[PDB]
């Protein structure tokens with residue numbers, strides 16, 4: 067039951083999570099200038115709202 | 121005041137009479153009578169006009185208050201106009217300000 | 222206006238006179254060698270004249286400008302970045318069939334804007350310095366406009382930087398509407414008794430944060446960075462990544478130092494979230510990158526996140542300014558060497574049609590010393606000890622521990638581990654197996670070798686850099 | 698007699714209109730037009746702020762803003778001319794080769 | 798004063814709304830020129846006489862002339878864009894519109910809670926603007942000359958034919 071070293075796999079889990087998160091984040095780098103402007107305006111909205119709620 | 125509001129009224133009437141005269145002229149023209157790829161040099165010239173127009177606005181603001189700025193203002197306007205003429209010489213010498221090659 | 226104030230202005234005057242002289246020399250004849258030499262002579266002269274400005278002292282040259290040792294340190298970093306850019310640009314521009322001389326004029330004018338941002342003490346001077354480093358970068362990013370990727374990067378950077386300039390200008394206008402004074406020290410002066418967090422002041426600072434965080438590649442204003450870095454010419458990528466980031470973060474450092482609204486808790490929390498997201502996202506997006514330009518763009522996002530972590534600890538700590546100085550020296554040398562190795566392997570410019578892929582795999586077996594420099598900078602940007610990048614990481618960790626910024630400290634550790642993965646992947650790919658000849662290319666190799674030796678020497682022995690950064694003090 | 702808030706709100710309305718025109722349009726020319734709208738709105742806000750306090754600084758910042766607007770319009774229209782020369786269309790979505 | 802300010806602000810808003818939705822480029826530029834004339838009228842209402850004169854001279858009289866020149870040069874008539882009208886259907890613009898509306902309402906909330914003693918409207922002449930511009934702001938003047946120089950150099954380098 068232990069021959070595959072389960073503790074090593076459970077400690078290897080954060081590497082899998084990092085690879086999945088990086089692959090998911092790289093989808094936003096689609097190369098569209100209009101989406102880049104849209105993301106700038108979205109970030110402006112988020113920053114302004116965060117500054118207003120404190 | 122009185123003279124300033126009289127002049128405001130006169131200027132507004134001048135505006136509306138001129139515009140109405142032109143529009144009435146075209147309306148009467150339409151009424152009366154019986155019926156039956158450009159080169160980049162244009163862009164460059166217009167762009168040069170824009171840049172030197174903004175620099176001209178700086179000189180416009182300089183020219184009004186000469187006797188309130190002293191000799192330091194003359195010095196600063198002198199570096200301003202020197203960079204102006206340096207850019208003009210740069211444009212002329214490379215062929216930017218020549219319609220024909 | 223005093224003549225000592227004229228002594229405080231010498232980097233600005235020397236760079237402007239170099240601009241005029243190089244422009245007139247181009248107007249006389251188009252000589253790449255002579256105009257490039259005149260440009261590097263003017264930049265070297267301004268770097269030398271920083272000593273005379275240091276002997277002049279420290280004073281407020283205008284309601285706009287203020288010069289102290291803080292400003293001279295930032296001016297020196299910007300001038301060194303510009304000199305390295307010109308040195309990398311000459312073997313690059315040797316292959317450029319169009320006019321090779323406008324490059325140096327734009328580089329010099331951008332260095333002038335960097336100097337203005339180094340010395341800026343005023344919203345007008347900050348806006349002017351931002352625009353003076355931006356518009357020549359519009360020209361330089363698309364200097365090879367016939368190349369498809371360079372034209373794409375030029376259009377992207379121009380549109381997005383015009384939008385960010387509009388955001389920054391609108392925020393400045395709202396701040397001036399509240400305050401009635403464009404001086405840095407008056408941004409929050411008319412408030413008091415706990416009424417520091419005025420909503421219009423905070424929203425104006427938020428719009429300025431949007432513009433400057435675009436300029437600093439901070440998440441979520443970061444998506445332009447890999448595309449613009451990949452599409453731009455490699456010396457232009459070097460100049461952007463070093464000079465633009467250093468000058469704008471220096472002026473942001475100064476703005477948050479003297480503005481009384483810099484002690485607002487809301488801006489601190491927003492900048493903490495931005496720093497956290499920048500570190501994590503920039504490290505995570507560079508995991509699976511086979512292109513060194515995009516990888517270095519994501520790396521720049523993470524490193525500006527670390528710098529922002531050092532920025533948040535400004536008011537609570539005391540060593541925050543020194544931390545920013547030491548980190549910026551290490552980052553300048555590291556990014557200079559990295560993008561320089563990329564530049565000399567991308568030199569000469571092969572044309573608009575041919576690919577400009579780096580192909581770092583197997584670099585040691587045909588070009589070994591540059592491979593050694595490249596892996597040294599990979600270790601330095603990873604923050605590994607024996608490198609000055611570690612010394613900067615240690616300073617950032619010290620100011621995060623002293624200010625009890627535990628979330629940002631944990632972000633630094635986790636993003637450091639992810640960075641270790643991708644940086645070590647690049648550094649070991651340099652020594653795997655894969656399937657110039659003038660003195661200017663040798664000068665570029667000299668520049669990257671010198672920067673690598675400096676980062677190694679100040680990794681093992683960091684005390685001179687610490688002492689000379691501590692020598693710089695502002696007019697508090 | 699004129700509130701400062703009304704001038705600031707008018708500038709904000711023009712700014713967000715320019716941002717909307719920047720985002721929604723595929724043609725690069727209308728993107729440049731929206732950029733001009735946003736920078737003119739920012740300059741207008743600076744004029745309103747300077748006029749409220751009775752200072753010249755608002756008009757000076759207006760002059761700096763329109764200098765920037767002239768420079769950016771020049772550079773953007775040069776880039777648009779280059780795009781129309783190379784690709785014979787002004788679709789900004791086709792300029793999307795770099796990604797990842 | 799207030800009366801001209803409010804009509805000119807309303808005209809500027811309406812003209813900008815026609816700008817960002819129109820399909821014909823020359824018509825959109827004409828609406829943009831109208832909005833610039835209105836913004837200059839707003840400047841003249843505030844007392845910034847130099848700013849209004851510059852809004853006509855520099856913005857409408859130079860920059861929009863450059864845009865009009867470029868549009869006439871390219872002969873733009875909707876190359877598979879007017880035939881599509883992608884920006885008109887709500888499934889395209891419904892996102893950016895509400896995003897800009899949210900940003901606008903946050904900015905307006907920030908504006909609504911400030912000190913407002915009212916704009917006097919006393920004319921700040923171009924002579925005083927010149928005294929300030931060549932008094933405390935001379936480094937701004939010089940570096941703006943270099944700014945326009947940089948823009949000119951960039952625009953010539955990019956906008957050639959060969």
Ligand SMILES: CCCCCCCCCCCCCCCCCC(=O)OC[C@H](COP(=O)(O)OCCN)OC(=O)CCCCCCCCCCCCCCCCC
Pocket residue numbers: 077078080081082084085508634635638639642
């Ligand atoms: C016991 C709990 C209490 C003590 C905790 C102590 C924490 C520090 C010490 C332990 C660190 C554990 C790190 C585990 C992952 C190590 C990296 C690794 O395994 O990399 C291998 C893998 C690549 O190999 P391969 O599977 O072939 O993938 C092909 C790639 N295309 O690589 C990849 O696939 C990508 C690797 C990305 C970078 C590594 C992951 C970093 C994640 C954050 C680490 C920091 C600690 C966070 C908390 C961990 C859990 C407690």
Ligand SMILES: CCCCCCCCCCCCCCCCCC(=O)OC[C@H](COP(=O)(O)OCCN)OC(=O)CCCCCCCCCCCCCCCCC
Pocket residue numbers: 128132798800801804805808831834835837838839841842843918
């Ligand atoms: C009539 C109903 C609407 C009809 C459709 C729209 C027509 C155009 C409306 C806008 C332009 C006119 C606005 C009304 C101006 C009337 C005169 C006025 O109110 O003057 C007051 C003031 C005088 O100056 P001041 O010394 O400050 O006096 C204040 C009190 N002592 O004046 C000032 O301070 C400045 C005066 C205004 C600025 C100069 C004129 C600007 C013109 C802008 C035109 C914009 C484009 C129009 C396009 C039309 C088609 C859409």
Ligand SMILES: CCCCCCCCCCCCCCCCCCCC
Pocket residue numbers: 593596597600606607652
């Ligand atoms: C820790 C600080 C940096 C230390 C030096 C890092 C490496 C620099 C380059 C030194 C020379 C490398 C030579 C590698 C030879 C590999 C041969 C492999 C044979 C299978």
